[PDB]
Design a protein around this ligand. Structure first.
Ligand SMILES: NC(=O)c1ccc[n+]([C@@H]2O[C@H](COP(=O)([O-])OP(=O)(O)OC[C@H]3O[C@@H](n4cnc5c(N)ncnc54)[C@H](OP(=O)(O)O)[C@@H]3O)[C@@H](O)[C@H]2O)c1
Ligand SMILES: NC(=O)c1ccc[n+]([C@@H]2O[C@H](COP(=O)([O-])OP(=O)(O)OC[C@H]3O[C@@H](n4cnc5c(N)ncnc54)[C@H](OP(=O)(O)O)[C@@H]3O)[C@@H](O)[C@H]2O)c1
Ligand SMILES: NC(=O)c1ccc[n+]([C@@H]2O[C@H](COP(=O)([O-])OP(=O)(O)OC[C@H]3O[C@@H](n4cnc5c(N)ncnc54)[C@H](OP(=O)(O)O)[C@@H]3O)[C@@H](O)[C@H]2O)c1
Ligand SMILES: NC(=O)c1ccc[n+]([C@@H]2O[C@H](COP(=O)([O-])OP(=O)(O)OC[C@H]3O[C@@H](n4cnc5c(N)ncnc54)[C@H](OP(=O)(O)O)[C@@H]3O)[C@@H](O)[C@H]2O)c1
Ligand SMILES: CCCCCC(=O)CC(=O)SCCNC(=O)CCNC(=O)[C@@H](O)C(C)(C)COP(=O)(O)O
Ligand SMILES: CCCCCC(=O)CC(=O)SCCNC(=O)CCNC(=O)[C@@H](O)C(C)(C)COP(=O)(O)O
Lengths: 248, 73, 237, 237, 248, 73
């Protein structure tokens, strides 16, 4: 485990993937996790039922993280039920890869709006509900390619890079009320988002990763847990690389 | 087709014999991707108007290029 | 002066300030500068006159860098006039500072759509027009804020951090074509108590930014792509 | 607490300050801490007693971390006693600040040989002993100075910037062996006017550094190698 | 060309390689270049004679850059002849690659002493002779692998990384007298230092370099020239990547 | 030699038939480098004392390993 002074956590896009495994990990450390989903609740409720049967406190909550009014009401309901929100994790993310010349301002905005704007609302509402309680930790799931860039991901990289720079400024804004903002920039994780991909391009990656494997969603998750826990109490505006050596 | 042969063969440094109708652009004629996007766009410089992504996705070898052109003429 | 293989350049938001001073600089090195403006012609043509008056080549052009059709069509006009395009500087930027809790999603979008999306259409048309000539250089004007962040600038930090990471990805995409992509991060350019954090003990002058940009477009930086060049007097190392 | 697959750990320069507080922390999580000291036993055994008194395991050991034979032999002694070695923290450091023009080559070397070369023998013996077990974690304690520099610390900035880049290279070398290498860069740890540059408006406490180190040695960071983790209250983002 | 307010420049290890091409470039921009060599003057004098025959002002000067007394006297003689030194370039560098377990504290120190200490003396003596004249630019040739690390180069990376952090501090120290320190971190340049290397490992690199070629020593050189020239007058404590996209 | 065969074959997951005297460690038996450094060091765990770098440089295939050992015995 790891100590937490807080009690509950909101994890946008937590139904599947790294978001799921963040919820399992924070739950099994005795936090109350609010699994967010946007569309089909059959996977989110299944996760919630997996976690309660293990004896952890869990819940599900429906909103589009890119929708301001839908996001703000969501947290308000979390505060109303629990009397405050201690930990936010902006995990919600989409990917749409295209060579720039075939890419369209819809495809740029689709990623910006879902990957960047959602995180802004999160961090913002995170200041609001946490300022008076003089405590808080937020973690924005970014990506290696916000630090490095990548071919065919001019929209995804634009959004992850904004998220890392934006998180730095929030950390300035919330630092005096002991509200810390950090980012996690994972390498290539064995999840839903990149599962469908050419083996010619996948073993291509493995041979560039010094640790010689794709990372586990549980491994991004426990790094997010450290950054939210109290062990990280002097760490703010940092970016934690979880990429097995793929970029240093 | 003959002028389609010469266009893709100029477009990526291969002579016309390479262009058999079902030689693929990548497994056979040896091209990255911008190479195929810029070829398709170059093929829309024949004014086959803006052939859709939903029909270009299925382009892999030169014969599909003869289709979709003579379709969108 | 500095060696340029290319002939012309497009400078978004160049009617005043740092944009004007990149146009002034880049013209004095022999390029035809395409100044654009969004609103006030009067001052934009003043600049075109000031440059043409020193015996440089210069042209104005009117479009909103956030508007896809206006800017795509612009570049198409410049290609059709001058034969092609060699250099582009995505300089267009806005600022609307606020604490986060006082900031509405409109206040975020106004900066993102106008600092980052504009840089996107720019770079994307750069790739489109510079590929046949296999040559080009693009420079995106960011800020120290895209590297450090800043209190009251979560919307701007977002758009400049975006622009930096987006630029690196374009740099991957156009290398297949000897099309280089790089960013410049200026610090404080010309209260005055903020000078104590700068090691050079002064506010950098806009010409000091224009020459950095000129170096990144010039042939000297012909092996530099994907880089971020800090012009900040040492404020952030 | 935190999950550790390994049993023991060696902490260079651990008799006092941040080193003592890494020993105290890492022991309270169940590891056998091998404190070392270079000179004063008295205070080093005080710490060994304080830990053993709370029912933790703990051992002292005497060697100069700059002295190759002393430290190679140390680790050989710890292997021979405990069967092997799992974790190492290169914490040994010195400081001798001066303006550059007042600084003699001896004043440079005293810091390089004693902050960076020590980290070298450490990491190098880490690779030597942890390979057969295919498991380990090494943490080098750097500083914000190795990232930002600082006036009057060209010798220390050199040794901490070295240690960071050296650590990344060791991380490449031992990945072939599931041996992770990472750095921690603490900011100001506990005049007081320097607190105005820290966003958290306070000097971090050494336990806040020890737990960061513990996280980097623990199994949670099992996909983190080559990273640099800033523990600086936001002084440098 | 490019404007320079200064007149002469000292370039440690300038006889061959990138150091040579720095000297050609700064010379052909009308600077007086002091080509340093450590051992055999047949290549340094040949360079000096190449440059004067072109009509540029050049010279040669013998010292081991890692030798403090030998370095300090060298600059003193440069000041005595020319009445001051405007521009220093710390180019002098050695490489010795070994897996760490086969590496020896001699091999660590050989690189540290030659790559790092030499640069310290340079920057230091650079403050001295430039402080009273309220002008100066210094450029330390580092390397990509000071930023990234690399397998088998724990000694080289240690030294390049120190050089980049050390240059930052000098830039603090000399900033008020308008003395600027910058580093250039090149990628893989087609010179003497890496010429002898396996084609299996060389084409390995090329395919990882987006610009799809090894850089030219002339290309590191013109980037050093910009950083010394006046066009860079607001740039200090920066690190300029000249690696063709190999690392971003 | 027989025990030399079994050592390198354990040392890098290959059976003894692979070990023909002039099979190379890298072109034949399939090994990176630490693999060969750690093998040589493992072979000095036979107490062939610290055979020099200047004689190990020339080790490429298993027969040289039979040399340099029976030299430094
Ligand atoms: N996996 C990797 O290799 C990698 C590496 C870097 C970091 N990450 C980051 O990790 C996060 C996602 O995890 P994953 O890679 O495992 O992807 P995934 O399996 O696709 O999970 C992403 C989830 O986010 C949800 N989501 C998206 N937009 C949302 C919104 N507006 N409101 C609420 N939920 C929303 C999803 O949407 P649906 O309704 O569409 O299911 C889905 O449940 C992202 O921030 C991604 O960019 C990925
Ligand atoms: N100077 C600094 O301290 C600092 C810091 C970092 C770098 N920079 C960057 O420098 C750039 C401009 O320099 P500046 O500070 O001198 O700013 P400025 O004084 O506001 O000049 C910016 C220019 O961009 C124009 N512009 C804005 N949006 C545009 C659009 N969509 N299309 C076309 N033109 C547009 C301006 O607006 P109007 O037509 O409304 O006048 C003006 O001509 C920006 O990208 C800024 O982010 C500034
Ligand atoms: N606290 C800060 O503000 C700050 C900033 C960044 C991080 N750190 C880092 O923290 C580490 C130590 O923390 P500290 O600041 O609390 O320093 P400290 O109070 O000086 O403790 C440093 C320790 O290292 C020992 N030591 C030095 N050289 C040694 C050697 N060759 N072999 C063995 N032990 C040796 C010390 O010397 P003695 O035996 O002489 O006592 C002492 O036990 C250093 O690496 C420092 O660079 C400090
Ligand atoms: N080439 C690359 O791929 C690459 C990439 C990163 C940057 N660089 C850096 O570029 C510099 C060298 O250029 P190069 O790669 O072209 O190497 P090179 O051809 O080996 O040239 C290096 C020169 O430095 C001299 N030198 C070394 N130590 C010296 C000392 N103490 N005093 C005076 N001169 C000394 C040399 O010594 P001799 O007497 O032995 O000739 C030689 O003339 C170094 O800082 C290197 O670390 C190299
Ligand atoms: C590390 C990854 C972790 C991460 O965060 C990235 C993702 O989200 S999955 C993101 C998927 N990762 C990739 O590398 C996909 C990139 N693919 C492309 O750009 C293609 O369009 C391209 C092959 C270049 C051109 O197509 P053509 O050959 O037809
Ligand atoms: C970019 C380079 C630019 C640069 O600055 C680097 C140099 O100075 S040349 C530095 C040479 N560059 C290299 O990559 C050499 C590294 N080689 C090694 O580490 C070997 O010892 C290794 C193959 C891993 C093990 O040996 P075994 O297989 O026998």
């Amino acid at each position: 485990s790891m100590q937490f002074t807080g009690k509950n956590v909101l994890i946008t896009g937590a139904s599947k993937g790294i978001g799921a495994e963040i919820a399992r990990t924070l739950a099994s450390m005795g936090l109350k996790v609010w699994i967010n989903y946007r569309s089909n609740a059959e996977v989110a409720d299944a996760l919630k039922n997996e976690l309660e049967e293990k004896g952890y406190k869990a819940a599900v909550i429906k909103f589009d993280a890119a929708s301001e009014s839908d996001f703000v009401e969501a947290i308000q309901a979390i505060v109303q039920s629990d009397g405050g929100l201690s930990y936010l994790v902006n995990n919600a993310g989409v990917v749409r890869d295209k060579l720039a010349i075939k890419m369209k301002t819809e495809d740029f905005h689709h990623v910006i709006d879902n990957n960047l704007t959602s995180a802004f609302i999160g961090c913002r509402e995170a200041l609001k509900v946490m300022s008076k309680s003089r405590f808080g930790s937020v973690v924005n799931i970014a990506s290696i390619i916000g630090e490095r860039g990548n071919m065919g991901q001019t929209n995804y990289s634009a959004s992850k890079g904004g998220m890392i720079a934006m998180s730095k400024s929030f950390a300035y804004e919330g630092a005096l009320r002991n509200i810390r903002f950090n980012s996690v920039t994972p390498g290539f994780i064995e999840t839903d988002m990149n599962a469908n991909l050419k083996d010619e391009l996948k073993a291509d990656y493995v041979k560039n990763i010094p640790l010689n494997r794709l990372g586990a969603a549980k491994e991004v998750a426990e790094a997010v847990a450290f950054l939210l826990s109290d062990h990280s109490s002097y760490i703010t505006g940092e970016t934690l690389k979880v990429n097995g050596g793929l970029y240093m | 087709f003959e002028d389609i042969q010469a266009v893709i063969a100029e477009q990526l440094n291969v002579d016309a014999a390479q262009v058999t109708p079902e030689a693929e652009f990548v497994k056979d004629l040896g091209a990255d991707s911008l190479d195929v996007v810029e070829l398709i766009m170059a093929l829309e410089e024949k004014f086959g108007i803006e052939i859709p992504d939903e029909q270009a996705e299925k382009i892999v070898n030169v014969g599909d290029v003869v289709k979709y052109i003579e379709d969108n003429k």
